[PDB]
Amino acid sequence: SVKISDDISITQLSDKVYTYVSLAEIEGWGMVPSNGMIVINNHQAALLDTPINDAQTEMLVNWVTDSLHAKVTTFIPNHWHGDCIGGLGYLQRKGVQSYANQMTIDLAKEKGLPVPEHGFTDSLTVSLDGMPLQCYYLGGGHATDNIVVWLPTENILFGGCMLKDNQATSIGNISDADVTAWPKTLDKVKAKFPSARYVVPGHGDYGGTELIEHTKQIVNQYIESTS
Numbered sequence: 001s002v003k004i005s006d007d008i009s010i011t012q013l014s015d016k017v018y019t020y021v022s023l024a025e026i027e028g029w030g031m032v033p034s035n036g037m038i039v040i041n042n043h044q045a046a047l048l049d050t051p052i053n054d055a056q057t058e059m060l061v062n063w064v065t066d067s068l069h070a071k072v073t074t075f076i077p078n079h080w081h082g083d084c085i086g087g088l089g090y091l092q093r094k095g096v097q098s099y100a101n102q103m104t105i106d107l108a109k110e111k112g113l114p115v116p117e118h119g120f121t122d123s124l125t126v127s128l129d130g131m132p133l134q135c136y137y138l139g140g141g142h143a144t145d146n147i148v149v150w151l152p153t154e155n156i157l158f159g160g161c162m163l164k165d166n167q168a169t170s171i172g173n174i175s176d177a178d179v180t181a182w183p184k185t186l187d188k189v190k191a192k193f194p195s196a197r198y199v200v201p202g203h204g205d206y207g208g209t210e211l212i213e214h215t216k217q218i219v220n221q222y223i224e225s226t227s
């Protein structure tokens with residue numbers, strides 16, 4: 001897991017897919033690593049989630065063209081939080097096509113946050129110059145608008161913050177959560193992606209299909225420890 005900056009780390013899953021970790025300070029939580037993925041194909045790149053601000057985004061964008069030699073032409077945010085579209089303003093200054101769950105669009109619109117240009121309500125297959133990128137909204141969880149991105153040709157699943165990492169014992173920031181549905185949403189995720197090789201969470205180390213079951217119990221535990 002190489003470093004590309006003082007606050008940005010990279011790991012390589014396959015020849016086309018990468019995962020990055022950007023360090024940032026969040027009032028109330030302190031130093032916290034946020035994950036995102038980079039997908040490449042025929043010199044073009046699709047960025048899933050951006051760091052929390054334009055500086056880290058810019059760095060990350062230049063590293064892609066410099067080390068991977070690819071133009072960032074596509075962006076998909078997991079949901080409306082800072083650790084997903086924090087640096088979308090930058091990306092837009094550079095003409096990047098943005099795609100998101102329609103709800104993410106409405107939330108950013110009313111909160112004066114930069115807005116993505118194409119919403120979907122259930123699913124969206126975005127073609128990165130040939131290579132498919134499948135986005136789905138299977139219900140609320142960490143956030144009401146959260147989606148997942150599936151890569152049919154890599155069996156790699158980007159779950160975002162609806163999925164916690166194996167070393168997590170806390171349910172985390174449930175300020176915009178929909179704990180009522182979260183549990184049902186997780187079931188649909190394991191049902192839909194049985195053969196997932198890699199499963200990347202919004203915070204923490206990646207792993208296999210087991211992060212889904214691990215997160216399912218952190219939540220159930222919470223619904224009852226507070227009920």
Ligand SMILES: CO[C@@H]1O[C@@H](C)Cc2oc3cc(O)c(O)c(C(=O)O)c3c(=O)c21
Nearest residue numbers: 026029032161168170171172173202203
């Ligand atoms: C519990 O998991 C993580 O570990 C603890 C120590 C710190 C932490 O901080 C967070 C801060 C957020 O802004 C946020 O939105 C989440 C969140 O996604 O819930 C997390 C998050 O993931 C975690």
Ligand code: NA
Nearest residue numbers: 036049050083
């Ligand atoms: Na991110």
Ligand SMILES: [Zn+2]
Nearest residue numbers: 081142143161
């Ligand atoms: Zn979030």
Ligand SMILES: [Zn+2]
Nearest residue numbers: 083161202203
């Ligand atoms: Zn998060």
